[PDB]
Amino acid sequence: DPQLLVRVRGGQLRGIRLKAPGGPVSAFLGIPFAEPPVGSRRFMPPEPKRPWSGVLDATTFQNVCYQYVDTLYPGFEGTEMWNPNRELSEDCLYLNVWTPYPRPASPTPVLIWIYGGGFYSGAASLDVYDGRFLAQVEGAVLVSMNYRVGTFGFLALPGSREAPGNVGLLDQRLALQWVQENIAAFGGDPMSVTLFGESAGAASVGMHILSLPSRSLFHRAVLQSGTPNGPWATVSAGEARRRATLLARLVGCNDTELIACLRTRPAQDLVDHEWHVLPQESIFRFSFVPVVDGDFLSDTPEALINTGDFQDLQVLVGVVKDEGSYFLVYGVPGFSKDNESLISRAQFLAGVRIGVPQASDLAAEAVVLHYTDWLHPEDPTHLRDAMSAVVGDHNVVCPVAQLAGRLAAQGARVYAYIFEHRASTLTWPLWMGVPHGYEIEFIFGLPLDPSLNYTTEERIFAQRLMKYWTNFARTGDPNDPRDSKSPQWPPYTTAAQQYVSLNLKPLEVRRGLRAQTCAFWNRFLPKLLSATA
Amino acid sequence: EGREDPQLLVRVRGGQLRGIRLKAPGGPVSAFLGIPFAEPPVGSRRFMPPEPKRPWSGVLDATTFQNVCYQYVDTLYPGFEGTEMWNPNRELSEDCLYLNVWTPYPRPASPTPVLIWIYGGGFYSGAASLDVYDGRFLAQVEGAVLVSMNYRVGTFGFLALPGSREAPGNVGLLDQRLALQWVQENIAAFGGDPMSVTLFGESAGAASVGMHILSLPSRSLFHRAVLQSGTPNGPWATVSAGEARRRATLLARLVGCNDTELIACLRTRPAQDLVDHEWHVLPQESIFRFSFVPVVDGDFLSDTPEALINTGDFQDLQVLVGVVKDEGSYFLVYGVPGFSKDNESLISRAQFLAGVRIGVPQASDLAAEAVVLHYTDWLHPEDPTHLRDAMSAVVGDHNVVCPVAQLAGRLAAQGARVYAYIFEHRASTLTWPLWMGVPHGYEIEFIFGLPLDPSLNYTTEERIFAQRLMKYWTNFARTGDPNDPRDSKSPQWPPYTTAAQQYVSLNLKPLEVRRGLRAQTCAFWNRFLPKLLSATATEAP
Ligand SMILES: NC(=O)c1cc[n+](COC[n+]2ccccc2/C=N/O)cc1
Ligand SMILES: *[C@@H]1O[C@H](CO)[C@@H](O)[C@H](O)[C@H]1NC(C)=O
C-alpha cells in the first residue's frame, strides 16, 4: 500500500492504516527523531537521529520515557488512564503522525500535541491522545512526540556542560524541527503549525513561545490548563542545583564527577528518590521541571511575558471548572475519591499550607480568610470546595488569567475558555466536578467512537470542540468562518476580559476570569510574601 | 404660683420646675427644657469631672432650651439645610450642662418606660436641642418619657492629660453619667419608670452608649441600649493615653501653653482659642477622625473597648444596633478631593488611592494597597462610578458597618440579646445629591417621628413608616423586643446571632430578614487588617 510508504530525510517508513468511525486514516507511529539518550547521553541535549537503511516499521507505538508510575488507586480507571501503556525505557525519543487516508492532496494544517504529567510522567501513546479522530473528521495532520521527563529530562546542574537542564524541552524542540523538515512528505503544511498541550504540556508550549529558537518552528499555540508562568512550572538555577545535588546525595554520588556517578545509576534508582527533594510537603509541585537557565529561558517566564513582543501570535487558552480537585486526593488529609471528603476547618487550614507550600504564616492566613465563606465558616461542603478552588486558582486559573492578559496587552490575538462539561463516563466522584485533564478526551474526539459509551449529545459536543480547535489551527480564530448565527467567540482583551463556556449548551460569553480572586493571587500576594519575607 | 397650669409644675431634687405645654400633631405634650444637672463647668472647673447641681430657690423656668456646649461650627456649605440642621441653635457657652424632658400631657398615671437620647457629632459638636431630636412625637404618640442631655464636647469634654488630677479625660462621658443618675433620682416625678431606662444615640452618641455598657458604674443606671451607626470599638471612638497626652500637649503649644502648670494655663484661655485649634492636632490628614474623644484611661474604660467586648459578660443586656445604607458618603464631601455635594463626584483611580490614604489614615502602605485591591472592581478598575461608590464603602465599612458587625457578634456570643437592622429609606425631603444614597445621620428624623408633622412636607408613606420605626424603638425600650406581641401576622424581627447573623431591612416595604452584615468584607477589616498592620514598624502613632 503506497499510502503507507513515506520517505523522510532519514530514510523510509511504513505506517499502518487504522479505522476511525468515519473511515480510514494513515498512522505512522514510533518514528525516531533522535539518537537514544542513553549511557553518556543521559541528561544531555538530544542529537538528531542517524539515517537508517531499508524500510523502518512505523506501525506501532514506541516505548514510554522512563518515569514514575502511580499506584495510589491500583487498577482504578481514573488513575490508570494516565499510566504508561507501553514498556518503560530511556530509549524513548520517538514521535507519532496521523494523516487522512488518502494522504491530503493539499498541504494541511499541522497540530502538534505535547502531553502533560507534571514534567515527571506522560506518554504520547495514551488512548486520550489518539489522533485518528482529528485526522479523519477534520482532515488534520496530527503529531505527538515523547520527551524525557523527571530527572532524565530536567535534572540540571546549571552551568555544567553535561547537565545544562531543559533537555526535555530540547527534545520537544527537536521534534518540532523534524516536523519542519519532514511533515510535507505526509501532506502536512510546515508553514501552518499549531502547538497544543495540557497542564505541563501547556507550560511547555508556553516555554516555546518564550524561547526564540523555538519561534521559527510554529505559528499558533493552545495552552490547556497550564502556563509557563506561575508557581510550579519552573525553578531558579539555584533551586535546581540544590535538588540535583540532594538527589545525587540520596543515591550515593565538581559537577563532572557528580553527573558521571549519576549516569552509572539504574533508571529506577533515580525515580525512587526523585520525589524526595521537594523543600516542603506539597501538592501541585514537581521535583524536576524547566529551569531558568539564562539559555532556553533568558529570564523568568514572568519577566519574559511582562516585556515580550507577541504581535504576530495567536493563542487559545483555557481551564476546566474544577482544576484543583484531582490533586487533593494525593496529598491533603481528609480527601478521597471514595467518600464525600467533607473536611473540618482545621483540615482546611492544614490543606492550605500544603497547597500553598511557599506561603508565610501570614500569606496562608490571607488565603484562609479570602476563601472562607463567613456566612458558613465551619461548613464541611464549603471548606472542601474552597480547598479545591485554592489549589486550582493558585496553580492554573490565575496564572492563566495573568498570561491571557499579558499576551493580549502585548499584541497577541487571544481566545479564552472555561470547560464545564463533566463526562458521563467519568469514574471520579461527583464532588470533584470537572477535574484537571478531562477536557482532553473531548478535544481529541474520543466520543465519536461508539464503543466508548459516551452519550449522543457528547458526540455532538466533541465535534464542536474539534471544529473550534482545528478552525483555530487553520486560521488563528476558533470561529466557524462561514457558519453564521450567534454566538461568536470573541477575543480575550484586557479591557473587557471576555471568555466562553464550553459545555453542552451553546457558547456563552462571560467577562472576567475570577477577576477579584485572581487579583488577590496575582497582585496582592506577591507584595505580601515580599514584605513578610 | 396661682394662675399657671397646674399640670406643668413639678419638683425635683434641686427644686421646683415650671414646664411648657407643647403642641404635637395628635395632641399636647409636657416639656421641661434646660434643667441644670451639674454645676456650670466654667473657670477652675474646666476639664474637670462635673459636680452635681446645687439646689436652687424659687421656681426654675424650664420652658426653653439652654445653652449649647462650646463647639466648632461647620461652615462648608453656608445656608444649606444639609449642614444647618446639625449646627447649634442656642448660644454657645461652657455653662451648658442642662437636660430636657418630654412627657405625655397630662403626665402618665403609671410609671412609664424612659428613653434617654445621647447626640452624636464626633465628640466635638452636637446639642440636645436640635429639631431632629424633638421628643414631642415619641412622647405624644407612644406615651414615652424622653430625656436628652447636653454633654461637653471637644477639648472641654475630652482633652486629657492621663493620670493628672486637673484633666483626667472622659469628663464628657461623666456629664452623661451624671444625667443618667439624675434620671434615676428624679424621673419618677414626671411619671417615668427609673427601673425601665433605655439609652439610645447615634454616631458618637452610639459610641457613648457603648461606653456606658462597658463601664461598671454606668451599668446600674440603665437596662437596655440602642446603638445607631456607631460603636465604642473601632478606629475613631477612642484614643490611647499616650495619644491623648500628645494631642493635649500639642494643642497647649498652639495656644501658648508639669501637668498642673500646663492645664492651669489652658484654663486661662478663651473658649474660642481652644476651639480654633482643636482640629489641628490630628496625626494625619483624615476623615472620620476626631481630635478629642474618649480616652482609654484605665478608669472609666478599664481597658480598650476591643478587649472589654471580647471578655465581658453581657447576659442581662438587650441591645438594638444598626446602620444606614451609605454610612461613608457624608464624610467624603468634606475631606476627600474629587468629592462634592454639587456634582456627581465621579473620581479617577488616582483620586481613589489618595482617598483611601485619607480614609484609612493609620494604614501602612501595604495595608492601604490591600484596601485598594479589595475594593477595586477588577473588571472595571478605572470606572469613575465604581471608584466613587467604593470610596464611600471603604469609609462606611471601616468606620461603622464592620465595627458594628464586630460588636453585634461579640455581644451575641457573650449572652446579650441583640437585634440588628439596616436603614435603607432616603427621605423625599433630603437635600444631598442622589449619589450619597442614605447618608450617616438620616434615619434619626424618622425614629423621632418628624414625618408626623404635616408642615415638614414628608409623604404619607413616610408618616406610616416613621410610625412603624417608633413602635419598634418603644417596644424595644418597653420589653427588650422590638416586635409587637399584639401583632402575629406582620413579619418578625429575629435576634442577631453568631450562627445565623440575621438582621432586617428598614424601609417603606414590610420587614425583610437578611443574613450576614457585609460578612465577607468585614472579615477583611475585622480579622485580616489588624494582622497586616502588625507587620510594620516605622511609623505612625
Ligand atoms: N476637630 C475635629 O475633630 C473635626 C473633625 C471633622 N470636622 C469636619 O468634618 C466632619 N464633619 C463635617 C460636618 C458635619 C459633621 C462632620 C462629622 N460628623 O461626625 C470638623 C472637626
Ligand atoms: C466637583 O466639584 C468639586 C469642587 O467644585 C471638584 O473638586 C470636583 O473635581 C468636581 N467633580 C467633577 C466631576 O466635576
From Swiss-Prot, chain B:
Highest taxon above the source species: Eukaryota
GO molecular function, one term: acetylcholinesterase activity
InterPro entries referenced in this protein's UniProt entry, alphabetically: AB_hydrolase_fold, AChE-related_enzymes, AChE_tetra, CarbesteraseB, Carboxylesterase_B_AS, Carboxylesterase_B_CS, Cholinesterase
Membrane spanning stretches: none
GO cellular component, one term: Golgi apparatus
Top EC category: hydrolase
Gene Ontology BP terms: acetylcholine catabolic process; acetylcholine receptor signaling pathway; cell adhesion; osteoblast development; positive regulation of cold-induced thermogenesis; receptor internalization; regulation of receptor recycling; retina development in camera-type eye
Function: Terminates signal transduction at the neuromuscular junction by rapid hydrolysis of the acetylcholine released into the synaptic cleft.
Name of the protein described by the UniProt record: Acetylcholinesterase
Annotated source species: Mus musculus
Gene that this sequence comes from: Ache
